mmCIF file of N, CA, C and O in Angstrom:
data_model
loop_
_atom_site.group_PDB
_atom_site.id
_atom_site.type_symbol
_atom_site.label_atom_id
_atom_site.label_comp_id
_atom_site.label_asym_id
_atom_site.label_seq_id
_atom_site.Cartn_x
_atom_site.Cartn_y
_atom_site.Cartn_z
ATOM 1 N N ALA H 101 53.478 -75.790 51.249
ATOM 2 C CA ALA H 101 53.260 -74.693 50.314
ATOM 3 C C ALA H 101 52.531 -75.172 49.064
ATOM 4 O O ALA H 101 52.854 -76.223 48.509
ATOM 5 N N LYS H 102 51.545 -74.398 48.626
ATOM 6 C CA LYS H 102 50.769 -74.743 47.441
ATOM 7 C C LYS H 102 50.001 -76.043 47.653
ATOM 8 O O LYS H 102 50.581 -77.129 47.632
ATOM 9 N N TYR H 103 48.694 -75.926 47.855
ATOM 10 C CA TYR H 103 47.847 -77.093 48.071
ATOM 11 C C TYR H 103 47.466 -77.744 46.745
ATOM 12 O O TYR H 103 47.201 -77.060 45.756
ATOM 13 N N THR H 104 47.439 -79.073 46.732
ATOM 14 C CA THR H 104 47.093 -79.818 45.528
ATOM 15 C C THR H 104 45.805 -80.611 45.725
ATOM 16 O O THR H 104 45.610 -81.252 46.756
ATOM 17 N N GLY H 105 44.928 -80.563 44.726
ATOM 18 C CA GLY H 105 43.670 -81.281 44.809
ATOM 19 C C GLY H 105 43.005 -81.446 43.457
ATOM 20 O O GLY H 105 43.660 -81.343 42.418
ATOM 21 N N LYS H 106 41.703 -81.702 43.467
ATOM 22 C CA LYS H 106 40.947 -81.882 42.233
ATOM 23 C C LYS H 106 39.587 -81.199 42.322
ATOM 24 O O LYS H 106 39.039 -81.025 43.411
ATOM 25 N N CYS H 107 39.045 -80.816 41.171
ATOM 26 C CA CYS H 107 37.747 -80.153 41.119
ATOM 27 C C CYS H 107 36.699 -81.059 40.479
ATOM 28 O O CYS H 107 36.935 -82.249 40.270
ATOM 29 N N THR H 108 35.540 -80.486 40.170
ATOM 30 C CA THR H 108 34.455 -81.240 39.554
ATOM 31 C C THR H 108 33.755 -80.417 38.480
ATOM 32 O O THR H 108 33.291 -79.306 38.736
ATOM 33 N N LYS H 109 33.679 -80.970 37.274
ATOM 34 C CA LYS H 109 33.033 -80.288 36.158
ATOM 35 C C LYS H 109 31.556 -80.044 36.452
ATOM 36 O O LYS H 109 30.905 -79.241 35.784
ATOM 37 N N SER H 110 31.034 -80.742 37.456
ATOM 38 C CA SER H 110 29.632 -80.602 37.836
ATOM 39 C C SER H 110 29.248 -79.132 37.964
ATOM 40 O O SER H 110 28.359 -78.647 37.264
ATOM 41 N N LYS H 111 29.925 -78.426 38.864
ATOM 42 C CA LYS H 111 29.658 -77.010 39.085
ATOM 43 C C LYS H 111 30.954 -76.242 39.323
ATOM 44 O O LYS H 111 30.933 -75.091 39.757
ATOM 45 N N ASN H 112 32.080 -76.887 39.035
ATOM 46 C CA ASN H 112 33.385 -76.264 39.217
ATOM 47 C C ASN H 112 33.645 -75.964 40.691
ATOM 48 O O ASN H 112 32.965 -75.136 41.294
ATOM 49 N N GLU H 113 34.633 -76.646 41.263
ATOM 50 C CA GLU H 113 34.981 -76.453 42.666
ATOM 51 C C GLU H 113 36.249 -77.223 43.022
ATOM 52 O O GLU H 113 36.202 -78.418 43.314
ATOM 53 N N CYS H 114 37.382 -76.530 42.997
ATOM 54 C CA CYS H 114 38.664 -77.146 43.316
ATOM 55 C C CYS H 114 38.781 -77.415 44.813
ATOM 56 O O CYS H 114 38.682 -76.498 45.629
ATOM 57 N N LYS H 115 38.993 -78.677 45.167
ATOM 58 C CA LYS H 115 39.125 -79.068 46.566
ATOM 59 C C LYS H 115 40.577 -78.976 47.022
ATOM 60 O O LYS H 115 41.500 -79.178 46.232
ATOM 61 N N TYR H 116 40.773 -78.671 48.300
ATOM 62 C CA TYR H 116 42.114 -78.551 48.860
ATOM 63 C C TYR H 116 42.061 -78.425 50.379
ATOM 64 O O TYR H 116 41.008 -78.607 50.993
ATOM 65 N N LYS H 117 43.202 -78.111 50.981
ATOM 66 C CA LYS H 117 43.289 -77.958 52.428
ATOM 67 C C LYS H 117 43.789 -76.565 52.799
ATOM 68 O O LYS H 117 44.683 -76.023 52.150
ATOM 69 N N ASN H 118 43.206 -75.991 53.847
ATOM 70 C CA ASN H 118 43.594 -74.662 54.305
ATOM 71 C C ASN H 118 44.493 -74.751 55.535
ATOM 72 O O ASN H 118 45.572 -74.160 55.571
ATOM 73 N N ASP H 119 44.039 -75.492 56.540
ATOM 74 C CA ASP H 119 44.802 -75.660 57.770
ATOM 75 C C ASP H 119 45.833 -76.776 57.625
ATOM 76 O O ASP H 119 46.959 -76.659 58.103
ATOM 77 N N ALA H 120 45.435 -77.856 56.960
ATOM 78 C CA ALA H 120 46.324 -78.992 56.750
ATOM 79 C C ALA H 120 45.640 -80.080 55.930
ATOM 80 O O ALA H 120 46.112 -80.453 54.856
ATOM 81 N N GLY H 121 44.522 -80.587 56.443
ATOM 82 C CA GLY H 121 43.791 -81.629 55.744
ATOM 83 C C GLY H 121 42.301 -81.359 55.698
ATOM 84 O O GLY H 121 41.505 -82.266 55.453
ATOM 85 N N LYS H 122 41.920 -80.109 55.935
ATOM 86 C CA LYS H 122 40.514 -79.720 55.921
ATOM 87 C C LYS H 122 39.979 -79.669 54.493
ATOM 88 O O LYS H 122 40.289 -78.748 53.736
ATOM 89 N N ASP H 123 39.175 -80.662 54.131
ATOM 90 C CA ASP H 123 38.593 -80.728 52.795
ATOM 91 C C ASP H 123 37.750 -79.490 52.507
ATOM 92 O O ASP H 123 36.587 -79.412 52.906
ATOM 93 N N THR H 124 38.342 -78.524 51.814
ATOM 94 C CA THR H 124 37.646 -77.289 51.475
ATOM 95 C C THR H 124 37.614 -77.072 49.966
ATOM 96 O O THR H 124 38.618 -77.268 49.280
ATOM 97 N N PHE H 125 36.457 -76.667 49.456
ATOM 98 C CA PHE H 125 36.295 -76.423 48.026
ATOM 99 C C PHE H 125 36.417 -74.936 47.711
ATOM 100 O O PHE H 125 36.117 -74.085 48.551
ATOM 101 N N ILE H 126 36.861 -74.629 46.497
ATOM 102 C CA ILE H 126 37.023 -73.244 46.070
ATOM 103 C C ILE H 126 36.961 -73.127 44.551
ATOM 104 O O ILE H 126 37.569 -73.919 43.830
ATOM 105 N N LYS H 127 36.224 -72.131 44.070
ATOM 106 C CA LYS H 127 36.084 -71.907 42.635
ATOM 107 C C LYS H 127 37.422 -71.519 42.014
ATOM 108 O O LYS H 127 38.425 -71.376 42.712
ATOM 109 N N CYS H 128 37.429 -71.348 40.695
ATOM 110 C CA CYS H 128 38.642 -70.975 39.979
ATOM 111 C C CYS H 128 38.495 -69.596 39.342
ATOM 112 O O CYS H 128 38.245 -69.460 38.145
ATOM 113 N N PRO H 129 38.657 -68.547 40.162
ATOM 114 C CA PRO H 129 38.548 -67.159 39.702
ATOM 115 C C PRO H 129 39.709 -66.756 38.798
ATOM 116 O O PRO H 129 39.627 -65.765 38.070
ATOM 117 N N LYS H 130 40.788 -67.529 38.846
ATOM 118 C CA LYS H 130 41.964 -67.254 38.031
ATOM 119 C C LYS H 130 41.619 -67.300 36.546
ATOM 120 O O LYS H 130 41.693 -66.288 35.850
ATOM 121 N N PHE H 131 41.243 -68.481 36.067
ATOM 122 C CA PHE H 131 40.886 -68.659 34.664
ATOM 123 C C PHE H 131 39.375 -68.791 34.499
ATOM 124 O O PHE H 131 38.824 -69.890 34.580
ATOM 125 N N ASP H 132 38.710 -67.665 34.269
ATOM 126 C CA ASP H 132 37.262 -67.653 34.093
ATOM 127 C C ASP H 132 36.869 -68.330 32.784
ATOM 128 O O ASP H 132 35.697 -68.621 32.552
ATOM 129 N N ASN H 133 37.858 -68.578 31.931
ATOM 130 C CA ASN H 133 37.616 -69.220 30.645
ATOM 131 C C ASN H 133 38.224 -70.619 30.611
ATOM 132 O O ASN H 133 37.795 -71.477 29.840
ATOM 133 N N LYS H 134 39.228 -70.842 31.452
ATOM 134 C CA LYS H 134 39.896 -72.136 31.522
ATOM 135 C C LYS H 134 39.774 -72.737 32.918
ATOM 136 O O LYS H 134 40.685 -73.415 33.396
ATOM 137 N N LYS H 135 38.643 -72.487 33.569
ATOM 138 C CA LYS H 135 38.400 -73.005 34.910
ATOM 139 C C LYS H 135 38.230 -74.521 34.884
ATOM 140 O O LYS H 135 38.190 -75.133 33.817
ATOM 141 N N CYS H 136 38.127 -75.120 36.066
ATOM 142 C CA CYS H 136 37.960 -76.564 36.180
ATOM 143 C C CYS H 136 36.692 -77.022 35.465
ATOM 144 O O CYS H 136 35.582 -76.638 35.836
ATOM 145 N N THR H 137 36.864 -77.847 34.437
ATOM 146 C CA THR H 137 35.736 -78.358 33.669
ATOM 147 C C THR H 137 35.779 -79.879 33.575
ATOM 148 O O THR H 137 35.094 -80.479 32.746
ATOM 149 N N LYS H 138 36.586 -80.498 34.430
ATOM 150 C CA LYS H 138 36.717 -81.950 34.445
ATOM 151 C C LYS H 138 36.496 -82.502 35.849
ATOM 152 O O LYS H 138 36.606 -81.774 36.837
ATOM 153 N N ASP H 139 36.185 -83.791 35.931
ATOM 154 C CA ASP H 139 35.950 -84.440 37.216
ATOM 155 C C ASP H 139 37.240 -85.048 37.761
ATOM 156 O O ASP H 139 37.886 -85.855 37.094
ATOM 157 N N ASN H 140 37.607 -84.654 38.975
ATOM 158 C CA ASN H 140 38.820 -85.159 39.608
ATOM 159 C C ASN H 140 40.056 -84.775 38.801
ATOM 160 O O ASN H 140 40.989 -85.565 38.662
ATOM 161 N N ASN H 141 40.055 -83.556 38.270
ATOM 162 C CA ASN H 141 41.176 -83.067 37.476
ATOM 163 C C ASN H 141 42.341 -82.660 38.373
ATOM 164 O O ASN H 141 42.337 -82.927 39.575
ATOM 165 N N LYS H 142 43.337 -82.010 37.781
ATOM 166 C CA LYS H 142 44.509 -81.563 38.525
ATOM 167 C C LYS H 142 44.466 -80.055 38.752
ATOM 168 O O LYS H 142 44.608 -79.272 37.814
ATOM 169 N N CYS H 143 44.272 -79.656 40.004
ATOM 170 C CA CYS H 143 44.212 -78.242 40.355
ATOM 171 C C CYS H 143 44.857 -77.992 41.717
ATOM 172 O O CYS H 143 44.697 -78.782 42.647
ATOM 173 N N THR H 144 45.587 -76.886 41.824
ATOM 174 C CA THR H 144 46.256 -76.531 43.069
ATOM 175 C C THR H 144 45.852 -75.136 43.534
ATOM 176 O O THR H 144 45.738 -74.212 42.728
ATOM 177 N N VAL H 145 45.636 -74.991 44.837
ATOM 178 C CA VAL H 145 45.246 -73.707 45.408
ATOM 179 C C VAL H 145 46.457 -72.958 45.954
ATOM 180 O O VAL H 145 47.285 -73.529 46.665
ATOM 181 N N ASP H 146 46.553 -71.676 45.618
ATOM 182 C CA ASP H 146 47.662 -70.847 46.076
ATOM 183 C C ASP H 146 47.158 -69.693 46.937
ATOM 184 O O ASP H 146 46.887 -68.602 46.435
ATOM 185 N N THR H 147 47.034 -69.942 48.237
ATOM 186 C CA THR H 147 46.561 -68.925 49.168
ATOM 187 C C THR H 147 47.530 -67.750 49.238
ATOM 188 O O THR H 147 47.184 -66.677 49.732
ATOM 189 N N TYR H 148 48.743 -67.958 48.738
ATOM 190 C CA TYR H 148 49.762 -66.916 48.745
ATOM 191 C C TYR H 148 49.224 -65.624 48.138
ATOM 192 O O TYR H 148 49.539 -64.529 48.602
ATOM 193 N N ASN H 149 48.409 -65.761 47.097
ATOM 194 C CA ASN H 149 47.826 -64.605 46.425
ATOM 195 C C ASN H 149 46.456 -64.946 45.847
ATOM 196 O O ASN H 149 45.982 -64.291 44.919
ATOM 197 N N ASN H 150 45.825 -65.975 46.403
ATOM 198 C CA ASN H 150 44.508 -66.404 45.942
ATOM 199 C C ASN H 150 44.503 -66.615 44.431
ATOM 200 O O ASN H 150 44.193 -65.700 43.668
ATOM 201 N N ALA H 151 44.847 -67.826 44.007
ATOM 202 C CA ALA H 151 44.879 -68.159 42.589
ATOM 203 C C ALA H 151 45.052 -69.660 42.380
ATOM 204 O O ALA H 151 46.148 -70.197 42.546
ATOM 205 N N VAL H 152 43.966 -70.331 42.016
ATOM 206 C CA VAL H 152 43.997 -71.770 41.784
ATOM 207 C C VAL H 152 44.564 -72.092 40.406
ATOM 208 O O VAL H 152 44.588 -71.240 39.518
ATOM 209 N N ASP H 153 45.019 -73.329 40.234
ATOM 210 C CA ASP H 153 45.585 -73.765 38.962
ATOM 211 C C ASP H 153 44.688 -74.805 38.297
ATOM 212 O O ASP H 153 45.138 -75.896 37.946
ATOM 213 N N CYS H 154 43.416 -74.459 38.126
ATOM 214 C CA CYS H 154 42.454 -75.362 37.504
ATOM 215 C C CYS H 154 42.865 -75.690 36.073
ATOM 216 O O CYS H 154 43.322 -74.821 35.332
ATOM 217 N N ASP H 155 42.697 -76.952 35.691
ATOM 218 C CA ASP H 155 43.048 -77.397 34.346
ATOM 219 C C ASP H 155 42.404 -76.502 33.292
ATOM 220 O O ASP H 155 41.235 -76.677 32.946
#
């Protein structure tokens, strides 16, 4: 439950797994003002209701 990964300030893209270990990237629509702006930061994907936890 709740996937954990990191994004990239380059173009913003939180990485995580959907099936189990499938390296998949996803933007941070949750915080359009506090989205991932760091490299290899701390962000978790919540498919439960589509909402990442970008730093």
